[PDB]
């Protein structure tokens, strides 16, 4: 079903260093997307690495997983209709500086490798990341009062 | 003149139901439009048949009219340059998931069937929105004290 | 009984003026009370004269009737409880010099003569005040989809 | 010592059906309170019972603990300076009608059985609440960047 | 006359490094106040020795002048009436620990000695505080379009 | 360097009389720009038609001359990787009637006389402009502690 679609949103160090995590929570928050999963977390290097297991071997790894771990993350999980692409077009291009205002990237940064936040790139990727960085367990379903005002009825 | 346009704004059901008509309004009043007639209402059906007119014939034009009765709605005159075409960027594209951040249901929407306000499509058409919506004692005219400031006649 | 109770809030000229429509609105639909009536208005004077009845005959009279002439207002009704009270209190306290930051006058004013909003005192008072801005035909009843979740039951 | 203080912050069922999560956590991010446990939660009924359980035996008991798991809720931790008693001031009185603009009930609340958000008391109080809604490895310890500009010296 | 009463704003530097300087300046743009000096500057120490004259005396003066070069402040002149008060009441109180919700210090500050800004304690301080930091060719006289909106002419 | 880059904004007399500098600001203090000189000022003629001078001869002229005398200005000096391209960006176009939502003249402003904000188009006119406009004693140097999460390692 449509509205059950998730994505993985994740408050990358330097996301939580400049006081962003409100601001991330609230574009998704005020869409009527419904947070189903959240916390922060001081991620462990092997964890990282299967996240970004796409990227091993390339030059750039090491510094990239050295970096993750600086400091802490914050993950969550947004359900709702097409949330996986209205997510990243909420926080705007990979690169800041191709970013738009209004968007969270254009917004609040400058630099790629400092781009504050993280959205799963397809619904295939989403589940495969929900599954990696929360169990089963973690995911809260729930209902929301403003349900029959954000979605349209069948 | 130029200065004189208007347009026909409109807080649907959703829009009022999910707290939302001080956000479309800021919108409007942050960029220099001028608000001339305001009120909330809860339209009859005979009302709402004429405003969606030319829909009538559709299979979800019934549903349309029911969801439109469910939940009162805030009516608008705004008055500025251009104001009918910016409006209608202002509020973003007819469907909220091909609509930008920055605007109003590209920030705050999901579904087309719930895309929380409405903007008179030309110039014409807001025209003959005004003319239903509103009686001519129900404008109020004023000149605005930044005028100066938002137009540049010499 | 308790969450029915009503108060009556306008905008005055320079609150328009001043481009604070949406933010006197937000005070109150961001708390969880209900808009249950709204409309811009040009009010004549004699209007404002039964609203400020019991000033007349004072020297600022005249010219405090032709300031609540001199641009559109913006009436509004909303409904919850202790409405009344807590409209006060978001609005601040009547002196914007004695209003806090935080509150409406306290945010956005300086004179007295320009608080950019009025609310109704109390209960009774704001009884009057609805019947004489509104007719009951302008009240919207509707029940908001968060009501289960702003109020106990 | 002072600054290693901590508190225990929880957005009720109310705060997040009325899409309030982001504002409770600014009101803190902002004022230079750092962020070291955060989660969401659907608690079982024996945590809430626990967590309640002076209430235990009320006619109302039984309605708050249903209430309590009617939706989610949101956990989190902040550290810093007088954290506990900066955060109840914060968050406002308990009862949203005695809580003044600029504070979050204040701003966002009515009612006092939907008072969107709840906080740790007292330093004991917190020390308690933490350790029963947080195991101490969901507690994340670092060094925030604006350190030197938020505390001296 | 009142309402040419004028107060010295200034950002300390840890307003400056936390990102503050909109927000000070907005508390008072916003309030119907009239921004009529403005400056960034890196005082030196004879500068600062002499704007906190009064704690020439006290033991911890040395490095509090230290402290307060350690980044650069962004100097304000603000105008309007009974602006010194409310200046003050807009901050909040010296300590940040006693400020309430609202107020600047009572929403971004925790510390008394990073309380992030400045505002003159009295006319008399005000008046020596803005002909030490300016010069009256830099404050900029000027009449706004909405001066008869914020005050009453009376 | 990248990073070293500068841009000169300026918020034009009608973005002060609107009381839209905190906003201004906002936007690129947000960004993770550095403000690095900042200056109210009332310019003559001499100043504002060297910084027109490239529309020396247009009919115009005079009256964009008068138009800029007519209140005061903020002068701003920002530095950060790209920030005279991002700077423009987030103003938005020269037209507020071309300008997107989320960007300043998009949000703000309807008039291209009236777009309440000025930035260097190239990195040359920026170098002119800044001189022309600002010492160099009037320019402040100091480093941000976010920079390292603003900017990657290296």
Same mark, same amino acid.
């Given at each position: 079903? /449509?509205?059950?679609?998730?994505?993985?949103?994740?408050?990358?160090?330097?996301?939580?260093?400049?006081?962003?995590?409100?601001?991330?929570?609230?574009?998704?928050?005020?869409?009527?997307? /419904?947070?189903?999963?959240? /916390?922060?977390?001081?991620?462990?290097?092997?964890?990282?690495?299967?996240?970004?297991?796409?990227?091993?071997?390339?030059?750039?790894?090491?510094?990239?997983?050295?970096?993750?771990?600086?400091?802490?993350?914050?993950?969550?999980?947004?359900?709702?209709?097409?949330?996986?692409?209205?997510?990243?077009?909420?926080?705007?291009?990979?690169?800041?500086?191709?970013?738009?205002?209004?968007?969270?990237?254009?917004?609040?940064?400058?630099?790629?490798?400092?781009?504050?936040?993280?959205?799963?790139?397809?619904?295939?990727?989403?589940?495969?990341?929900?599954?990696?960085?929360?169990?089963?367990?973690?995911?809260?379903?729930?209902?929301?009062?403003?349900?029959?005002?954000?979605?349209?009825?069948?």
């Amino acid at each position: 079903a /449509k509205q059950q679609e998730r994505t993985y949103i994740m408050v990358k160090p330097d996301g939580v260093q400049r006081g962003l995590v409100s601001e991330v929570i609230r574009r998704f928050e005020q869409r009527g997307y /419904k947070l189903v999963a959240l /916390k922060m977390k001081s991620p462990d290097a092997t964890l990282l690495e299967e996240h970004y297991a796409d990227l091993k071997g390339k030059p750039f790894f090491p510094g990239l997983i050295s970096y993750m771990t600086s400091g802490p993350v914050v993950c969550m999980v947004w359900e709702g209709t097409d949330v996986v692409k209205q997510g990243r077009r909420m926080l705007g291009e990979t690169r800041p500086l191709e970013s738009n205002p209004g968007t969270l990237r254009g917004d609040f940064c400058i630099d790629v490798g400092r781009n504050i936040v993280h959205g799963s790139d397809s619904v295939e990727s989403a589940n495969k990341e929900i599954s990696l960085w929360f169990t089963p367990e973690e995911i809260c379903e729930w209902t929301s009062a403003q349900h029959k005002w954000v979605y349209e009825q069948g």
